[PDB]
Amino acid sequence: GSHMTYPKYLLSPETIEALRKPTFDVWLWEPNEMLSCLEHMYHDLGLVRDFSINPVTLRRWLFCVHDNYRNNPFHNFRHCFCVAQMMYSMVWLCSLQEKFSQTDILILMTAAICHDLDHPGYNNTYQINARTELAVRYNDISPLENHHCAVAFQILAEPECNIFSNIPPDGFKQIRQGMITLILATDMARHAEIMDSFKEKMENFDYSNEEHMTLLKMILIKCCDISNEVRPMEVAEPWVDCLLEEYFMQSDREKSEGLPVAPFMDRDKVTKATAQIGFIKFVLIPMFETVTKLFPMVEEIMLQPLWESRDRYEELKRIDDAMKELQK
Ligand SMILES: Nc1nc2c(ncn2[C@@H]2O[C@@H]3COP(=O)(O)O[C@H]3[C@H]2O)c(=O)[nH]1
Ligand SMILES: [Mg+2]
Ligand SMILES: [Zn+2]
Numbered sequence: 145g146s147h148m149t150y151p152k153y154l155l156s157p158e159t160i161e162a163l164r165k166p167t168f169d170v171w172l173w174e175p176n177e178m179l180s181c182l183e184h185m186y187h188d189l190g191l192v193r194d195f196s197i198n199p200v201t202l203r204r205w206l207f208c209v210h211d212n213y214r215n216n217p218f219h220n221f222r223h224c225f226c227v228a229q230m231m232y233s234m235v236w237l238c239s240l241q242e243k244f245s246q247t248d249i250l251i252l253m254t255a256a257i258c259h260d261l262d263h264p265g266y267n268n269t270y271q272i273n274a275r276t277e278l279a280v281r282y283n284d285i286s287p288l289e290n291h292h293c294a295v296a297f298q299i300l301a302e303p304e305c306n307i308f309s310n311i312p313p314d315g316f317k318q319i320r321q322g323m324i325t326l327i328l329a330t331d332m333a334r335h336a337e338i339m340d341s342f343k344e345k346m347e348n349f350d351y352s353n354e355e356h357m358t359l360l361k362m363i364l365i366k367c368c369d370i371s372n373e374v375r376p377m378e379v380a381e382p383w384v385d386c387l388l389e390e391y392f393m394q395s396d397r398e399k400s401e402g403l404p405v406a407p408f409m410d411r412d413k414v415t416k417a418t419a420q421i422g423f424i425k426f427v428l429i430p431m432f433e434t435v436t437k438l439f440p441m442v443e444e445i446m447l448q449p450l451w452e453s454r455d456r457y458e459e460l461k462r463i464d465d466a467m468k469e470l471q472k
Contacts, residue, residue, distance in 0.1 A: 145158075152173075152174070152176070152177050153176050153177055153179075153180045154180070155177070155180050155181065155184060159181075160184060160188075163181055163184065163185070163229065163232065164232065164233060164236050165233055165236075166230060166233045166237070166371075166374055166375060166445060166446065167375070167376055167379075168229055168233070168375075168379075169376075169378075169379050170222060170225060170226050170229065170375075170379060171222075171379065171382065175210055175221060178221070178222070178225045179203070179206050179207065179210060181225070181229065182206055182225065182228060182257065183202060183203060183206060185228070185229075185232050185253065186202055186253070186307075187199075189232075189235065189241075189249055189253065190246065191246065191249065191250050191253065194246045194250075195246070195250060195307075195308070195310065195311050195315075196310035196311075197307045197308075197310070198307070198309070198310070201304065201305065201306065201307055201309065202307055204304050204305050205299065205300070205305040205306070205307045206257075208299050208302070208305045209221075209224070209257060209258065209261065209299060212261050212262050212295055212299060213260070213261060213262070213263075214262060214263055214264070214265065216263055216264075216265040216390060217265070217386045217387075217389035217390045217393070218383070218386040218387045218389070218390045219260050219263035219265060219390065220263075223260060224256075224257055224258075224259070224260055224261075226371070226372065227256045227257075227259065227260075227365075227368045227369050227371070228253060228256040228257045228368075230256075230367070230368040230371045230374070231252055231253055231256040231364070231365070231368045232253070234364060234367070234368065235249065235252075237439070237441055237442065237445055238438075238439040238441065238442065240252075243351055244357075244361075247315065247318060247319060247322075248322070248357070248361065250319060251319055251322035251323055251326060251361065252326070252361060252364060252365065254296075254307075254319070254323055255322070255323045255326035255327050255365055256365060256368055256369075258292065258293070258295075258296035258299075258323065258327065259289075259292055259326070259327045259330050259365065259369065260292055260330075261291075261292045261295040261296055261299075262291065262292065262295045263288065263292065264278070264288075265390055265393065265394075266393075266394045266397070267288065267394065268286065268287055268288050268289075268331065268333065269404075269406065270394055270397070270398065270403070271284075271287045271288065272284045272287070273398070273403045273404055274401065274403060278291055286328055286331040286333070286334075288331070289327055289328050289330055289331045290328070292327055293323070293324055293327040293328065296323065296327070297320070322358075322361070325358060325361075325362065326361060326362060326365045327365075329362035329365060329366060330365060330366060330369050335366070335427070338359070338362055338363070338366065339363075339430075339431065339434070341359055342359045342360070342362075342363050342434065343434060345359055345360075346434060346437060346438075349438065360438070363431070363434070363435060364435075366431070367431060367432065367435060370423075370427065370428065370431075371446075372384075373420065373423075373424055373428060373449070373450060373453045374428075374432075374446045374449050374450060375449070376449070377449075377452070377453065377456065380453065384416050384419065384420060385416070387419070388411075388414065388416065388419065391408075391409040391411075391414070392409070392411045394409055395409040395410050395411060396411070415461070415464055416457075416460070417457045417458070417460040417461035417464055418461065420453065420454075420457045421454060421457045421458055421461060424450055424453055424454045424457070425454060428450055429447065429450055429451075429454070432446050432447050432450065433447065
């Protein structure tokens with residue numbers, strides 16, 4: 145509702161406001177618009193101010209991150225934007241600036257943005273089983289996540305992209321360690337371990353305990369990474385097809401190459417509805433349930449849409465199953 149028309153990469157006041165909430169429609173925007181959103185987040189969170197980030201370096205860095213995301217069906221730049229935009233939403237929803245230092249917020253946001261850089265479109269189990277150059281490089285230890293992190297810091301070592309160039313060395317070392325911990329924590333193999341450790345701390349949680357706070361930040365980046373189904377159905381739904389497209393590409397390849405296949409990626413065994421019912425019930429709901437014990441406001445904003453998505457997928461499954469009753 146402005147008196148003239150602006151270029152798309154100039155975010156409207158309504159977009160800037162919408163960006164603060166998990167209802168934001170991530171599909172609406174092209175890459176250069178998404179880049180403008182991410183830029184706005186760094187200014188709006190006070191990170192440009194508190195870390196003396198050169199504003200032009202911020203943009204060059206974002207452009208370079210974008211260029212180093214691959215065009216996978218799921219693990220692409222739009223996914224990175226989702227994860228970061230959910231993290232941003234969490235900052236406001238949970239009032240994280242009351243609990244976390246600016247350095248922690250910087251770690252959270254930058255890790256979120258960087259956490260899937262240069263993803264090859266085939267997961268760690270493929271890397272390991274196929275004995276790829278990556279699996280060999282990283283000795284079968286979270287090869288993809290180690291790689292994402294190493295690319296992150298290769299980008300940040302280019303002077304014209306170094307958004308940390310005005311932070312003193314000790315600050316840099318603190319941010320580097322935090323980002324490594326958080327990006328490595330996104331390896332889903334470690335999900336049960338990290339949830340257990342967190343739940344231990346949750347027996348008597350202490351915001352001034354640095355170990356407690358490291359685990360909270362790992363849980364937060366983990367929430368955001370797998371958060372799609374928290375979004376409105378019409379935003380969330382198209383992601384599932386993207387996920388399955390990547391899964392099926394891998395499992396087709398594994399069958400062909402003579403490698404082991406996960407039943408959860410097998411296009412013979414797997415459907416949209418079956419994929420999501422399990423993940424929502426047994427991974428997402430329980431995770432957000434534990435978060436909701438620190439941040440009660442999470443139940444209404446995030447657990448509700450998950451209960452809704454679960455129920456809807458259970459309905460879809462009934463129809464899918466009937467439809468297969470017709471095809472023998
Ligand atoms: N079934 C399902 N899995 C998801 C969804 N979102 C993300 N994931 C999984 O969670 C994993 C997070 O780590 P990965 O990036 O390796 O791969 C991701 C997917 O396998 C989802 O909506 N449904
Ligand atoms: Mg990942
Ligand atoms: Zn991811």
